[model samples]
Target: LSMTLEGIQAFLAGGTIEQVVTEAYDRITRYGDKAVWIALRPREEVLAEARALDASPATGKPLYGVPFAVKDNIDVAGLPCSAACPAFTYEPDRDATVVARLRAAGAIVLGKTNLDQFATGLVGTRSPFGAPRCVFDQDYISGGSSSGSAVAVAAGLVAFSLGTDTAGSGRVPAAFNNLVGVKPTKGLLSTSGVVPACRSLDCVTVFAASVAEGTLIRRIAEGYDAADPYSRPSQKRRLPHVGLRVGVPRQDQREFYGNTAYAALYQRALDEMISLDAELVEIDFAPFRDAAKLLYGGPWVAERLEAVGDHLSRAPDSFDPVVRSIVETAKTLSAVDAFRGQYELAALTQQANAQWARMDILLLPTAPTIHKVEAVMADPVRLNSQLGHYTNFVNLLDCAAIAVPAGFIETGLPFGVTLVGPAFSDDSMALIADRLHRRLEPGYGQDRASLPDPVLEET
Candidate 1:
């Protein structure tokens, strides 16, 4: 069995939840990838959680007895919230709001997964716990600050898991491992217990094997929370299925980092968009690209300072040096830059709106390129920055984005594309993304197993 939510749920219909939980632990042992977890519930404890679910004697409830993993930055009662920085670890006595919500819906919390230290980098290599590589290739970096959570789901350790995205953190790993990642509009999913990276732009993201599965997890994770000031009430939004106007960056704007295989793969993905009756409108991407730069180029890095600057100052050596360097940039900023940054982003937003006015949504490469783990480590900052080219602007622009597996190149490295929509349009975004994913990629995860049809979840 593939261990998809549907597959596992189907198995539960005919079998025991204990069997599924046992098998998850079995897979973790079989894979021999300890880097994928910062800490796991003892196998016995998790099995007992499953046994508890089985004894509840309820049926037909969504996600009943399903398993999931949480990024370390998010709290899970007894699990220590390290955000991958060992020196800063603290035990939380309660689950994060989102984690509690998922548990209430009957999904078992498997364990805390690893991430880039302090959620500072997109390259998974920033974790002191050890970098989690792409499931398909041992030498390739798994994209992160949500690194191990993505690997957990892709490697079948869990059906779905949480990831936090500030600068394409979740989407990049999803692409690297052939999964669907939903970087929902900020505040759609509560961040109450999440360790902040760039608090205002930070988001709790979802990673799953298919858009259908991703959407299901997202729905369970999102709700209004008084504890989180950023939380908002979700509103239903829709997009036309036919004759949809999809804005594409002009031909000159596309960058694949010299990977012709990825470049050509993108061309076929665009064709599939056309196949779905989308009207491809070329737009100048300069505004979007400029906005992306504001994230690191401007003073927002100072917000990262606000989150964990104290720990950094006291024990700089404890951090992954690459992450420390990035967060350290906050010390160089003046209050003047923060104000100017907002003014610049507002101006760019106006320019971006003119283009948005011409289309229903925007589409872009999930990442401009891929890099080997060794290459990323040797040249950390520059290469990791390149990974966020198309993704960094997303949350800054208040957009919802879903990255879906597009196609794998001949070498078997997978590339993916992202669909961006205005805030609260996740329902429609998944529908469009589901169609694109089906037409483009054959299957998902390290094994390339078959995907089920879209789970219609629109309200």
Candidate 2:
């Protein structure tokens, strides 16, 4: 398989795309991780589509012949849109706006991939379909709720995949699987056709082997959509690349859930950023932690309850027990608590800004630590919440983020750090994120794929 997006496209510049599609399917068949995909396109039909793309003129389609996966929560025309809840499945008549735009750009959807039910957990194991294990280790959780999306990309089953990030679904999965996860700014990508996790806080995300590839997908899929009430016009925000003020959590505030190796790996990642001329400025992470707590510890759970209106009661058993209980907590939260949550979030946002002023972008662990599937399944909530320690606050605080591979742990599990900026700085953040990802050459996928050349200017 051609490892990176540009590599695939370069081959297709003269080579046949049909073979690429077939090779991808062959890999999928051989690898046989049944849980990685909730649904897959018939190989012959997918190959036929690629053959058609080969005969057609490419024109403005930059993604011509690229095969990708969509999280089941996001609609792909003709595919079953199960947010991993079997009884709640629906076939969307049309593609989600992002999917339609990508299709227009000539990307081919290989299938709908598995995810946490209703896009709920950071642990990818919540689905009835099954947990997609980390590509490097079957013993580990793939990270959720974009579990299958990251696994598909990391295992080289597809070039890229779409995921939803209300908190950390996209980034956590990418971190575990060793890929770039773009959790774009909220309102930048339309959420019109996606099942809501937290309607107002939700953002569409992408996972790819390279930062440039993921960022390119983000650009193509982003635009204001009339169909989505939350959509906003795109904007550009810049952060200085040279002498970038990178924020690291204050020593006392950093948590790794007792994973000493993760703490050490994070220190090494900090060294890598310092090597890039980043000025490591220690900032209080309290406010960010406070926001993260509000997201899970407050009325935000109600929004998830809102997502599955009567399903919790109607098809009680269909809901994953862990996910059901998590969402069930919202029943006790009242409208007054919702307002109180809003007031507290507003206050926390200001407090977070005070720390943001100390740095250009915050570089923190994508996840504190990763767990084995057995461990996550045993203590689902606490361990899952631990995975979101660094990530849950990003969308909640209205920041854009890119989670890129930092390096590997002693056991061969991957580690990642996120580059976060105030909303609308997605483009600028990728410049630094690509640099960080590229710093560890040939570490992107389970196959050790090297990154493509950077698309954006480094300065």
Candidate 3:
């Protein structure tokens, strides 16, 4: 089985890194799912990289010999960037800034995993490549655009994986897969070489078995890039160890879309936070929810439409029907509508700030609940929208979030919560998430027995 970063590093220290890669390839092959990968690196290529790493003296490279995967929307130099759309496949000669950073840190790229078409949907079922099913129950929706990336890490196929989060693509999948997902502040990680869903909002994300692992990857991957106009330097911030103020929606404002189990689990999570010595504060969530609606509900759909260029008009049938329908709605939006959306968003942002002043971090369910594959398939649009109830507002509000597994519902489906903070709060948010994840003691993924309790003392 694949291990967390420290576990994998210890495994590499004791033996050959090539053996780990070999085992990873075997696991991927054994999984036998076309939905997990749109393109895989030749096994020989990965092994060769591992061999090279073994041949050299360990230079204290952080991710040395750690095997990982990238979402198809992020370029991996030699692999095809499909964005889960066969017609859009292209080969690149250089890695995306984030991938290159990981490679330079001595992490081996396994391959490119599948994603929703053009990174436009929250549901994992949007791809032409088969929808990657949930690892616990094959019939459940995998919560996506970052579907395959999350599942790869969840199934122990890789130690970690790169995913892009424009809306909740990164966090939602992590919540469903029982993994830690770090959605950095927009532009905190370079978006160069990525197929943007919303250029201004797109963020590179990390999915790992633990918060420590995800935070490690985030640290290695983050840096301002001159080439990526969206890139910005991250600021240093540390969340209070004690007496931290945590915000939650007022009881009347909580929305679970009829999932009482999830609603209960959410309260349980708040209780857990209180146990961690966080001061629980209730705030009006109406502004955040209202802001979330503007993402797909308003002119922001135009941003996705802009990303696809003329593809939507030229090869209409080639696009996913749902994606096409959603992006096409942008055609009716004019400059007036765009400005109108911006003005409304500005007002909402101010309203959200008032709540921000009341807390150091915000806590919410990563997703309201899980949807069975058949249920989501039967009611794609509405069900997909329901999953983003707590998530869609983050990027829209320019916040960073870490989604950590909370626990399981009575139905045995995994329930998770997210730690949200203002931009540049990546490190602080990660620390809080790491504490909650460790406290829950929820073992990783389908194989809950494999939990590795690493010392998380901050340096």
Candidate 4:
């Protein structure tokens, strides 16, 4: 994504942070009826902040002068915390660690974006606040519970935005919206101030126009947080793709869910990877899919039940009935069942790791199908599950993934694939994603394919 700090620097030098933010506000206004942002921090307030930053030295902050949005579930000091539930809303007294880090780096906080209520669905339609649609096609879904964050970045409203991904909430939105979604390894970004959907699985994710921009934001926001039990020290490693072999699900095993157009788009992406000189190996994606099923269809649903607390008992009606049904199913699972589920997942993860050793990275369809807003609303649970068919397993296996747009489907919806790698391989996955995006989906950024190449920029 040209939303990288380097590109933003060019924009800042050529115009100014104030001008860039002004343009973003203008677009948010121009887009008019699209339910993109939940709470826009007012253009005047945002521009004033940008102007203040310009008045001071940058201090070498990585994201200085760049505008970003935060998913409403994350705390932002004075910003209202809704988590897409108006009834559960409150104002946070301090910024979430990730937001604090970004602010310290001089990033402008644009506003909070809408999301699936209580972050309960993969499709973006569950919120009472209103759903955010995919940037290119208004009829197609902008995946959620990070809906607004993805749309904002995809529509060029900001350079980047933060979203919490637990069960593909982060990456699913990216794939659906034609943006880069980084599901950092669990604990990679702290959950100190994030409202939990599934506490242990939740991760602070970065969404941006390109993989490099996502990774850069990941580096900036990553750090230890005493308040978050799940937080971990950031891990870094460098590897060359020179002898790397990337894995793709065997053709027969791939699931496009009757969307032949999306399948064709994926095939073209795979072709580009081959053209990029990487060896493409076919593997049985069965084990990964099996593990993914365990997240929603297994005992983990009980964990989500625990997150909503007593609300499940006193106000079941308050939830989107579909979300409530999903969480309510947890009542059927016993503590012993949850333990057995854990044991089975451990065994499956070992199997998945063995499969990973055969390839350096796994390239797979981000979602099996692309759904329209009306389709999602018709059967929310089923449609949401379909979207997570390829995604729900990543975090369960403790792996990292970067979702990059492949191209556009015949209907103009974003067709995308996710790059999966071993834990702590985030940086490498992102770098490869950057190259994949430029090669397969060339019309991003200024929509001028010939704009200065990303690879040469050393992002």
Candidate 5:
């Protein structure tokens, strides 16, 4: 039984809420991936929460008794905030704003899952803790730094989970696991309790078995928090879905890192958009690529240093060498270089903003492709960079995105597409993504079963 908010509500009414929580714990034990959770609550603790919820009458708590996981980078009150580095661990006295919001809605936190140390890498294997494998293929990488959070949901261990996306941590793993990933516009969800991984770019994200579930979770988790400097109020608005103008990369610009199956699947995704009546406009992808490059190719490496450089200096041996190497590069960037990078990014942002006039939504592969765990381990940096080809530009351009399952490639691996739109267009983007996801394949998670179809209306 894959857990979904709706499914859990039904299960609670039909059977006992206790039974649903019991099965979730059972799944975690059976999955046997010690790597999936860096820290989990005791079974008794979780059961106690369920029993408490069961004792109360349903009070319109949308996620009543629904279990979820949190990426270690985000706080969960008493849980240790490791961000996958044992040496940097600390217990939080209060829940992260997003965590508190969900808990208020009656969703229970299951545990803090693994991640690339400090949420630094798109490839999930950078952790000293074991790499969580793809649910469909054990040999494949789980995609990170939200690696374990996505897999836990995919494996039926939880209904949904919180993840952080600075540079595709939220979208990449969702693609690999065949789940819906919502990378909301920056500042839409507070990052107050989340550890910084380029604090300016980091956003709390959600993973769910379906777009409807993912959207619901985002709506609940999002609110303006005065405590978070990055927090901003969401501009509530809606847009019609029919006859939408969808933007796609010009044919020559799509990159799959030599994986032809991934390329084919992306084409199928575009066709699905066409079938859904979206007007596909092929645009020059260079400005977006340039903006993406500045994220790591320019001064943003220094931003990583801004977050964890001091810690790295004090305890260099405590970090993964690769992560240390990446963050260490910040030492070489001068303040002048930082200004120059921002100048370059501003020019590119203008170029990118100009393109938004031509389309209501931008559709691209959530990732260029997937990599085998060994392949990633052999060449971490290059392969990881390739995976971010389509994703790294989103936050850099300040766009909202939703990654939904596209289909599987020939190697029995999954492929997914991300829908990008202007900032504050989150709800509208989800409506379009939900329509595309339901129309393209309709099934989710490792179970390959259909979700309750979402009824989207033209507004």
Candidate 6:
């Protein structure tokens, strides 16, 4: 009936692979100006690829006939890699390692989607291509730099999409769009051909309708690529059998930026955690907050420079005025400051790991705030900083997360919380998020006639 792990599975079980793939292509075309895809593979090419998958035998494959999109930064052979900036375009010689892996698993590649220019902004408005809006409301942000990828999946244009998460790009958009955002531990998924945005910290990300689909995608995208120096060897671990430990900010520490509606909805989500028999542990936010500050606050800003400094310096006016300013700051940062940030991060990381030892997961607001396109543009820098409050600390501390929609607030937008866990807990974290999403919104995408359309009902 809709695009989901189960929905596609049942459809493929009963119908031809070509039928499901054709419907996905139909929806992608029908959505029109959702601005979900920036550069799509031709329709004929997509169908041809799907036909090949159909000719082969399906032997209980995890993703037999699912269609998915990839953010342009992640390569697909012969496709342009714009990263939402047409000025910096190039055609990839081959698919990114993750793309090849997914194709091998029988998932159809629809096309590439839009994003914040160079994956720079969280509000999804930084692109020259125009902002991709939230599925329920065109006026609100779709969230970014995974903006288009999230929208495409949330609108049922694809079963899932691959995105890059550095800072909160992966999780924040899902919070805004009412979908599941899974950020695996940095290095768990290969970023060999991915355009760098703080390459050291970026993790290939996924936006899915359910956690089950997300995990299935993660297993496919993840593998060791010797070419990538930052790709770490996979560390397998046993699943936790104990009651899941959920971490949330203390009452005084949590900030919804005067949005009491978001606070109330977050509280309801916490109650749901308790209902699930998960233990809530109140933790001090200082260590994590300090570490989060290192991302843009300290030397990590320099890493952004390291990635694009040459181009920026060569053509200062080429970048988004806001993203350019942030990247340009690397010229002024001192070697001493960079080293100091690294030392501080090491100490904070140890503290974070120890804290994780006591609790299995941290359930916190994905973003302490959400901003409208107008408001974000009015004050882009500060608004982007505020969005990272819950997300910045994630990769710096080496953690995995799944952002699950909790419910809806009175503003007629989605409310969601992120489940953070130790590395290699990718599958386990997703399993927990999958269960929570079904409870909050059981039906798929925009077709929820059988279920309540929270945005319409609440508004």
Instruction: Please give the TM-score that candidate 6 achieves against the real structure.
Output: 0.93
lDDT of 6 by residue, 1-459 (tens): 567766777777768777887888888778865567888877787778778888888775567878889998899886899888777788999989999898778787888899988888788888888888878777788889999999998888888899999998889998888777889888988998899999889999988776666777888889989888789878854445357677777799888888888888888877765566567888776788889989999888887788777778778788888888888876799999989999999999888877776677787888877778888889889988888888889899888888978777776787777888877777667666666666665543444312221221100
Off by over 4 Å in 6: 439-444, 447-459
Off by over 4 Å in 3: 449-453
Residue 252, candidate 4: C-alpha displacement in angstroms: 2.0
Q: Which residue pairs overlap in candidate 2's backbone?
A: none
Off by over 4 Å in 5: 237-240
Pairs in clash, predicted candidate 3: none
The ten-residue window of minimal lDDT in model 4 covers: 444-453
lDDT of 1 by residue, 99-212 (tens): 988888888888899998888888888888888999888889988889999999889888889989998886999999999898888998999998888999999999887888
Kindly indicate the candidate among 3 and 6 with the higher TM-score: 3
Model 2 TM-score on a 0 to 1 scale:
0.98
- The whole-model C-alpha lDDT of candidate 3 against the native structure comes to 0.86
Q: Give me candidate 4's TM-score against the actual structure.
A: 0.95
lDDT of each prediction vs. the true structure? 0.87, 0.88, 0.86, 0.81, 0.88, 0.81
Sort all candidates by lDDT, best to worst. 2, 5, 1, 3, 4, 6
Clash count per candidate: 0, 0, 0, 3, 0, 0
TM of each candidate vs. truth: 0.98, 0.98, 0.97, 0.95, 0.98, 0.93
RMSD of each: 1.3, 1.2, 1.3, 2.2, 1.2, 4.2
Clashes, model 4: 3
